[PDB]
Nucleic acid binder design. Structure first.
Ligand SMILES: Cc1cn([C@H]2C[C@H](O)[C@@H](COP(=O)(O)OP(=O)(O)OP(=O)(O)O)O2)c(=O)[nH]c1=O
Ligand SMILES: Cc1cn([C@H]2C[C@H](O)[C@@H](COP(=O)(O)OP(=O)(O)OP(=O)(O)O)O2)c(=O)[nH]c1=O
Ligand SMILES: Cc1cn([C@H]2C[C@H](O)[C@@H](COP(=O)(O)OP(=O)(O)OP(=O)(O)O)O2)c(=O)[nH]c1=O
Ligand SMILES: Cc1cn([C@H]2C[C@H](O)[C@@H](COP(=O)(O)OP(=O)(O)OP(=O)(O)O)O2)c(=O)[nH]c1=O
Ligand SMILES: Cc1cn([C@H]2C[C@H](O)[C@@H](COP(=O)(O)OP(=O)(O)OP(=O)(O)O)O2)c(=O)[nH]c1=O
Ligand SMILES: [Mg+2]
Ligand SMILES: [Mg+2]
Ligand SMILES: [Mg+2]
Ligand SMILES: [Mg+2]
Ligand SMILES: [Mg+2]
Lengths: 274, 276, 271, 259, 257, 271
DNA sequence: TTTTTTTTTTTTTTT
């Protein structure tokens, strides 16, 4: 029902000291113009194909799970449960686990696998999802029934597969689920084809209207983060982060540069100056 | 019946061109020269890109109409909850940014300045909010107009009430909602601000890069530019704060075009008039 | 039966052949379509803000005072007091509603009632104050009042393609049966490529919202195009799109608007 | 049974094979589809205002003065008086319902009336299938023209099957007019867009159950709005289709004449 | 449809080494291995493309070259027109279109008996019993039906036709019409026909056995240069573009070029 | 579906305790690490530059030399033609290039020696010809117990964007959670400007025709470039365009085409 | 408890 503005004296008070930003890792130019992430705050993450969307969000989920105490729930749909679990273990132990059979055969026999397991999953902070209406119900049981603080979804086009009406209704339902709940919602979508010139995977600067499916994805999201790297140029591991849209602050543009470490799998804050 | 002879209609005209008319905008001077304010029974539709000041400019207008003029103003803001839009108005009235600083929130918690800034604004029943199927939204707007008596009702983000209901074709539901909304506005005679988005251009620049928005760029139907009485478009190029105003269609006068310029003050949050 | 041979028709042809209602502004209309005729349906087409109701209000004024014909307006787009004030101001050469320094001036000067019965003195103008009910009210205007012209401002909000085909067939049947000059206004569709109509794109007969039978059952189509965000948003172009009683179509004339008064008055503009 | 061998058929073929009704204006029609024949269904289709009924009224005139066949008109679009006044003005070479001085100058009205109604040729029309069966059995009509099919998918397919069955039963030349569909991309038909056989409202039976289709295309908002292009879209007897010729209108007279 | 590697033990040797044949652009029966009994052969194209011309040419070439008893069902016209057309097609002279020659040749019985002297053809001016009589009491090995557009009610009819053909074993040709294209060109200006373009229901391509189609740019540069497409063939599987025919307006025979 | 990370104590241990490598070119092996359960490998080239040659060659080398069940579903040609291609390529002859060779093999009984050397171990399966296809491939994977499944010529299998998007989504969701290497053969779209693909244009990642889902659901993307008009028309260039597992893309290596046995060999071309 | 025509609006690609 409707509300009267004198009954909001006791609740705006309670909202005033409750809101709290959750900082990003890997680049400090993101945190200075976003002030983190709050309860009821849909964050769209995008790049070209294979430019590093799942690795970045997996690093963010790792840093919010073992360093800040936040209970993080994932719904990675590109991959299975054990694949992303082994990638989390190999990333928290600063190596490249699944891309080497020698290390996987080594760490299973000397008994240090339980040492690398219980340093993460001992506190029970991470949660995973096993693969339109049942998805949001299981996210609601993930939030209220368990108690997670950040909920991550990946590769939104599985849910829609008329696409524009369904993706608009889906984006509306995810924004309405994020609001009145108190959970950061990280959403990943891809970019359509470039019309002329070069491509987004060759380093073409991403604009805001390339979020494929509708134009309703940039109109129900709060913070839109875009990554881009030129795999054909001179430095194929130099990503650029661009804030396309920020509703809470209004500061957008080039955040900063990062460098990816092929031996550890961590992308780390670079000192690159254009 | 309902067929009116134009001879037995004298007294109504004697009580129509006597009294209303007025209720000017704020932030830019050249807007009020063209549209001559907002009137009862009209529909004013404000459009921009994404995150481009179509809620900040309307909150900055709803402050000036509900405080400095005594008009009871209702806000169906459906993008955010009631706790944030009632808290950004306190900062805008006191010329700060209360949500964008955790230092000032703790400062007004400690010394008790929050009660001063709360009873300065919400002391008189002027701002009427709502927290959250299109046959209940207009029911709540009728309960606001008939029961509480708002003089300016602002419906923000009309795209959330066309997509939260199960309908096959989107254009017919937009047209039916728009004509029922104009009927409610003309029946009750309340000023009605509607906020909606724009669609993707086919090629060239985008709306967030300096694209001059035309009247055909309204997203959803063609019933948006045919059933509204005043259309205001706000345009910027992220000088990422200089927002200019275009009047697209005024039914009352004939003046449409480049109204003027506004600027956004980063520490306070106001739309000051500019000069260029 | 209902068959009639062509030999036994000497009388009814003799009483049928034993120019029409002229227009106002841009003198190449009644040069081209030769005015309106009893039992037609006329479509007035433009984009939003281009002056459709502004154009037809003037014709309702010139057909209700200088010609004496009983006129019935049906403005579903507005109310009765606003169109009554606009008629009073349009006949008195003063833009009435758009100036508040004169609205209270003429009501204490006493010349409001001098301006009222000067044009509303006869029983000429009849207004409609808000589908089958609409047809019954148009029939009550035709039978119970004897209207010579009936104007309808907005066809679209009658609709709660088939419901528009049935509507246009029923209105054409009413116009052919009673012989009343019926003017109906409609809007244009959203084009897929290029400019809108409001930036001065010329209108084709395809651009009609709802269906395509709006052009198949009317007898003439008058389109008005004006460059709204341009160097002059007052000069309009009038294009006659269809004429079944003469045949000639194309660009007829031009009407400047003369912002001080409000009369669409013709101009010279070659190319 | 109804089975008939091909050998017991020598009689009924011998009486059968021992051109038809020509057209006036655009002489590459009867050069191409060899004119009209009995039992058929003919479609003359174009856009609104392109000049369909002017063409078919000229053909109704020329099939009742030089030929003498009983012509039954069915103009559900307008009145029975206007369609006769146009025939009188078209025969008398001076346009009638547009010069208002001549309408009271002629009132030699009966001299113009009886000169073209001195026979019992024409029959106008003021359920519709029963009226056409009456016009065919009790009146001997050789040509029947129908201008308005629209107010008369499934209920259009049934109507077209019933009209084809009536034409097959009676052997009457039958002209039917319907309109074009609304094109969703590109120009309108009225600025010179050539008509495809898809461009027909209602359903697809209008091209499946007829026997020939004639289309007129003219650039209406152009420099020459009085020059129709005539296009044959279908002909079961010949197969010869395409662009036929060009007719000028001659506003002064009203006669579609070739050039 | 999943074939193991052992099941081609002799069949590749079968690659290392028919029925009724078709006329014109001889890669038809080179691709579908000719017509066979028990089949339901569909010839579907646009209006004016020449379905009746094609199937009438095949009805002539299956009654003079083979001598098999042929039954026609030309419900699109009458029994005299479809006989005059066969006589004119056999005698290399376009008959019903030339006004002078129709009264010049009336040698009429000489042209009649040379092609109708046997008991080959069986024409037609309830329908299931008529088809069963034309099979059983008349010995017809080929039955042709030209108009099904006037005869759930199409699915029942097609199941009943297919059960009749299964019970008998007769070559059966049925012609229906295409659907209206929703976007692009029409079938008559050179748009290639897909298998989905069939009216009524979807069982027309699921209870048939082979489908032939024709494409020609009718309002075009050369409207007499057709292209033939095979859309389905349960025996072979070889589908696609078959060949080219010109019409030869003076004669009426679809001759290959 | 709601999974706590505490019950993964023994499942992850089961997952740790495998790449299937590419033959004929070690340059593909240097930057792909083979193929694991759920590794969709998209293969493409120009207009006739040898897609099915290379994919059938890898199917031949994975079956008769490594003991993996390979299921082909070649839809360019039928079952007998791809069986003739398998046997004539494994026996290193040009089978369909001369009629004199097809006659010699059947007169001396040495054809029956060539069925036993390949098809006797049941390490190959074929397919005889979209929602009717996945239920067959699921029984091919689960019921037979195969490991590699190949699909060819996607253009006949598939608004041609929603179809190929749903197809690619269904194939990726089938390859996941089942454990198959699903090789998918696609095409390239036609070049607008510059040089053509028959002349040696460097291929781009956005030339996968039909949608953009062909590079956004793949795990590995391999393309082939051959200049059939240039200096060496028998020289192909293998280019990795996408890798999810490693991320190392570019010119993998070179292979040389042969007009004597039909094969293509590893090359040593320098630039 | 199935199949064909008409029409206005948002996206992704095609020779
Ligand atoms: C960020 C980054 C990743 N990589 C490598 C390591 C990652 O495992 C691999 C990409 O893995 P992902 O990030 O998981 O792939 P993606 O989500 O960007 O694309 P898609 O879902 O469409 O397949 O690329 C680099 O080589 N350089 C880089 O800078
Ligand atoms: C007008 C303007 C706003 N801003 C800031 C003010 C606000 O904090 C923020 C705009 O937030 P909102 O007003 O909420 O954004 P919006 O209504 O225009 O669109 P949407 O709801 O689809 O996102 O940007 C600028 O930085 N520069 C400007 O010129
Ligand atoms: C014709 C014309 C109108 N006008 C202005 C004066 C009128 O007060 C104002 C109103 O135009 P309207 O006549 O009301 O325009 P419309 O009815 O076609 O649009 P809609 O009903 O969809 O809203 O237009 C001009 O300024 N110049 C002109 O040339
Ligand atoms: C063919 C032609 C017609 N005309 C005009 C003159 C005639 O008065 C007019 C005839 O109008 P109609 O032919 O009666 O219009 P219509 O029948 O196509 O439309 P509807 O669907 O409503 O029945 O066409 C020309 O001016 N030049 C021409 O070349
Ligand atoms: C195939 C072909 C036919 N024709 C002509 C010869 C025929 O007399 C004319 C008609 O062909 P028909 O075969 O008679 O057409 P149809 O009976 O199948 O039509 P529908 O069922 O759709 O009503 O087409 C050509 O001119 N060129 C050609 O290539
Ligand atoms: Mg990914
Ligand atoms: Mg907003
Ligand atoms: Mg109006
Ligand atoms: Mg007509
Ligand atoms: Mg036929």
């Amino acid at each position: 029902g409707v509300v009267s503005a004198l009954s909001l004296r006791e609740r705006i008070r309670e909202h005033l000291s409750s809101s709290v930003g959750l900082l990003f890792s890997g680049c400090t130019g993101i945190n200075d113009k976003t002030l983190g992430a709050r309860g009821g705050e849909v964050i769209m993450v995008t790049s070209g194909s294979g430019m590093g969307k799942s690795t970045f969000v997996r690093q963010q989920a790792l840093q919010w799970g073992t360093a800040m105490g936040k209970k993080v729930g994932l719904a990675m749909l590109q991959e299975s449960v054990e694949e992303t679990a082994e990638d989390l273990i190999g990333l928290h132990n600063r190596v490249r686990l699944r891309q080497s059979d020698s290390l996987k055969r080594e760490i299973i026999e000397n008994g240090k696998f339980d040492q690398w397991f219980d340093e993460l999953f001992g506190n029970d902070t991470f949660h995973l999802y096993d693969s339109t209406d049942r998805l949001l119900a299981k996210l609601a049981y993930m939030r209220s029934g368990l108690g997670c603080d950040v909920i991550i979804l990946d590769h939104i086009s599985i849910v829609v597969s008329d696409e524009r009406k369904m993706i608009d209704n889906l984006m509306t339902k995810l924004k309405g689920f994020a609001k009145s709940t108190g959970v950061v919602l990280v959403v990943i979508c891809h970019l359509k084809n470039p019309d002329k010139g070069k491509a987004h995977e060759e380093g073409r600067p991403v604009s805001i209207t390339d979020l494929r499916g509708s134009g309703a994805l940039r109109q129900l999201s709060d913070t839109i983060i875009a990554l881009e790297r030129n795999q054909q140029g001179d430095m194929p591991n130099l990503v650029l982060v661009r804030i396309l849209k920020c509703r809470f602050t209004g500061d957008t543009g080039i955040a900063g540069y990062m460098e990816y470490n092929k031996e550890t799998g961590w992308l780390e804050p670079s000192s690159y100056s254009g």
